[PDB]
Amino acid sequence: PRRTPQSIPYQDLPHLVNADGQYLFCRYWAPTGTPKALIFVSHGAGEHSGRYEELARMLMGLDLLVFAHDHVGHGQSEGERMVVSDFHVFVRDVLQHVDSMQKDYPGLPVFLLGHSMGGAIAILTAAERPGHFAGMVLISPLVLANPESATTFKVLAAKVLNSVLPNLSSGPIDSSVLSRNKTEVDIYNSDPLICRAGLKVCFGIQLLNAVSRVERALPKLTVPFLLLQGSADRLCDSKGAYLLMELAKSQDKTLKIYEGAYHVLHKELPEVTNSVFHEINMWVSQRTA
Ligand SMILES: COc1cccc(C(=O)N2CCN3C[C@@H](c4ccc(Cl)cc4)CC[C@@H]3C2)c1Br
């Protein structure tokens, strides 16, 4: 029996096998009756699908069937931790899962919800299939890197390093910049399914590839979207949210800025989290009625 990295047999859990023969752990939240729509939840770097329990329960409460998987190299899925052969693997695997759900629920509209790197994955998925998705909810999507981290000098130095020692790691991401809510920082720091090892050079290069690919995809993006962004985000720069609003061709695009908020808006100070849940609820409800 194939087992998760935590030694649990996949036969005990919801799962799928991707095109590379890797098992991905899956999570579902289905309503009691006929769903109004489907929504895939796309998590960020280093985290996993279980972090979306409360948001998913809210969406299921709106009669959507919510589905997710842990991206390769994350959570309870297989793969070396936080590495990927090419960023497109994440997009391909989302499309596999979406195609499987659409075959089981034909005719239902499908939405995407993505945070952080998961938001870049959602943008690239929707840009790969224009007109396929009904809408997207983006929570601090990866559109622009922190400008102090991604200078030309440092990107060229990382490309040189990647050519020699692709597995060399930097220090870990500073978890205190994820959220002003210190209880949520403590929860993040003690979740065994989160990867807090330093970012490997090779994966840093894939995240730079995601940024480059997102920029080229923006003029192909026509899907309706809700974009939520904190003004003090040190991981996905707020300028990227403004760039997405300017360059996406979508006729239905809305931005809400949370002044002073950090990166994980759905796990921020209660005033911010409650607003994020309310805005997503309203936006999805208006587009599923
Ligand atoms: C747990 O890891 C997490 C948690 C939360 C967010 C992220 C993430 O996606 N980022 C935070 C880093 N930044 C690094 C940046 C970069 C790479 C190489 C070089 Cl030379 C310079 C800059 C590319 C974009 C990513 C986005 C991660 Br990674």
Could you write out the DSSP letters of every residue in 171-202?
PPP-GGGT-S-HHHHHHHHT-TTS--SPPBHH
20 is catalytic: no
User: Hey, whose CA ends up nearest to atom 12 of ligand 1?
Assistant: 235
Cβ of residue 116 lying under 6 Å from some atom of ligand 1: yes
List the determination method. X-ray
Residue 149 appears among annotated catalytic residues: no
- Say if residue 105 is exposed, middle or buried (CB neighbours under 10 Å; 0-12, 13-18, 19+): middle
22 Cβ neighbours under 8 A, 6+ residues apart: 72, 77, 78, 79
User: Whose Cα sits closest to atom 20 in ligand 1?
Assistant: 155
Which residues on neighbouring strands pair with residue 17, listed in sequence order? 23
- Among 42, 116, 140, 179, the active-site one is 116
Residue with tokens 């009756």: 33
Enclosing domain of residue 194: 1-289
The rounded distance, in Å, linking the Cα atoms of 69 and 49 is: 6
The resolution in Å comes to 1.2
Q: Is the CB of 208 under 6 A from ligand 1?
A: yes
**Vertex 7: Cα angle to 193 and 100 (nearest 5):** 70
Total domain count, the chain: 1
CA of 130 to the centre of ligand 1 (A): 27
Question: 111 near 135, Cβ under 8 Å?
Answer: yes
233 in active site: yes
- Round to whole Å and give the CA distance between 177 and 263: 7
